[PDB]
Structure 1
Amino acid sequence: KQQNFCVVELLPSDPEYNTVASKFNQTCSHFRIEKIERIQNPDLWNSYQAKKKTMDAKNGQTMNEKQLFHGTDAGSVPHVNRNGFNRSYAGKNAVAYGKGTYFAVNANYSANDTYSRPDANGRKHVYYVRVLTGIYTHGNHSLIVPPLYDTVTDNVHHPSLFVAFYDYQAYPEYLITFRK
């Protein structure tokens, strides 16, 4: 009924393409990028920005937003484009640092075939996501919510991973379609 969306392909000549490709290529330059798409979900965006506003108000100097990677299967792409990373989708993720959605600092982490499952045509899907990491601590497998902390990480001093527990904590801004 809501969180309708549009999928807008970036021209390789679009500055936004150059920018996403760069971050991706820090760790995944051995992959070939077929396409980069912007997900335009105004309802999902506005919800994310409301959440951001409240967090920015409470965490003081903290830079609350990171751009992180999320590998998924072709079949979850329409679900994530509409709903973002909601509670039912969290159920589908691993549970190492809690029951939420997992995002990687580095693309190579997400580019694994366990996360970005190659589809029937060998294409893999990694979103480049705005995540409200805010104030985070070390996570563990029992958590259904953060212990509140905004997110949890594998390593507070040197994060590789973040887990978000709340709806509207992440915006799936870009979808990278690639192959081996």
Structure 2
Amino acid sequence: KQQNFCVVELLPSDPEYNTVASKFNQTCSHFRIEKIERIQNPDLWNSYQAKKKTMDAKNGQTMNEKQLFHGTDAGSVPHVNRNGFNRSYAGKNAVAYGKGTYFAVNANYSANDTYSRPDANGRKHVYYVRVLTGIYTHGNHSLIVPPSKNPQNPTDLYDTVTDNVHHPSLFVAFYDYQAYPEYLITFRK
């Protein structure tokens, strides 16, 4: 499957725009939003929804999905809109909590120039992503996949890892189709 996509601009009058902007402005109200775009990728959406169905059927009462932030440079925007946050993604970091893609609870973390690098025109880019966090544990630098939940069953693993299990600020996703880049926020200092 090709995973062809379309990019649709949201009007400030749309209730979806106010929902996205309000969440972004909880920690980044000092920045100015230029535009919010919706990413429409049917094959990526279908593979994401299939993984969500499998996760919902095994985790009981757990609310398996969260909406998190991810800053990236302008050059990565066409790669993310097509493939999401896969193995070939340039922003795959091997840092403190494992080798995978990092997502922030608060936009201010993603709004750092190291993550959302300003382009030639001074525009910064942060995605508002649907992430299947599921059941998570504390991460470590050696991880390339999540740890096993039970030492007796090394087959059943955690869904993601975090920096702090009871008060998280970050999540690390290790698999393809575990995150959908629904909205793209373009803003400046």
Q: Shared fold (TM-score greater than 0.5)? A: yes
Q: What TM-score, normalized by structure 2, do the two folds share? A: 0.93
Q: How many residues align?
A: 180
1:76 offset after TM fit, Å?
0.4
Report sequence identity in percent: 100
CA distance in 2 between counterparts of 1:57 and 1:90 reads 32
Q: For the Cα contact (< 8 Å) 1:139–1:152, is it kept in 2?
A: yes
Change in CA separation of 1:171 and 1:86 when aligned onto 2, cut-off 3 Å? same
Q: How far apart are the structure 2 equivalents of 1:74 and 1:122?
A: 10
CA distance in structure 1 between the aligned counterparts of 2:8 and 2:20, rounded to whole angstroms = 14
- Per-residue displacement from partner, 1:10-66 (whole Å, max 9, x unpaired)? 001111100000000000000000000000000000000000000000111100000
Residue by residue over 1:146-173, the C-alpha shift from the partner in whole angstroms, topping out at 9 and shown as x without a partner, is 0010000000000000000000000000
Does the 8 Å contact 1:132/1:150 carry over to 2?
yes
Change beyond 3 A, Cα 1:134–1:92: closer
User: What's the CA shift string for 1:122-167, capped at 9, x where partnerless?
Assistant: 1000000000000000001110000010000000000000000000
Does structure 2 retain, via aligned residues, the 8 Å contact 1:104–1:162? yes
Instruction: State the 1:78 CA deviation.
Output: 0.3
Distance 2:100 2:5 in 1: 23
CA drift of 1:92 comes to 3.7
Larger CA Rg, structure 1 vs 2: 2
Please give the root-mean-square deviation of Cα atoms over the aligned residues, in Å.
Answer: 1.0
Secondary structure, aligned partner of 1:168: coil
4+ runs deviating over 3 angstroms: none
Q: CA deviation at 1:90?
A: 6.2
In the TM superposition, residue 88 of structure 1 has moved relative to its aligned partner by 1.6
Q: Which protein has the bigger helix share? A: 1
Contact 1:91 1:99 in 2 (8 A): no
Is contact 1:66–1:133 with CA below 8 Å preserved after alignment?
yes
1:73-129, Cα deviation, whole Å (9 max, x unpaired): 000000000000001216643522111100000000000001000001110000000
Aligned to 2:184, the other structure's residue is in SS state strand
Q: Could you state the TM-score of these two structures normalised by the residue count of structure 1?
A: 0.98
C-alpha contact 2:94 2:141 (8 A) present in aligned 1: no
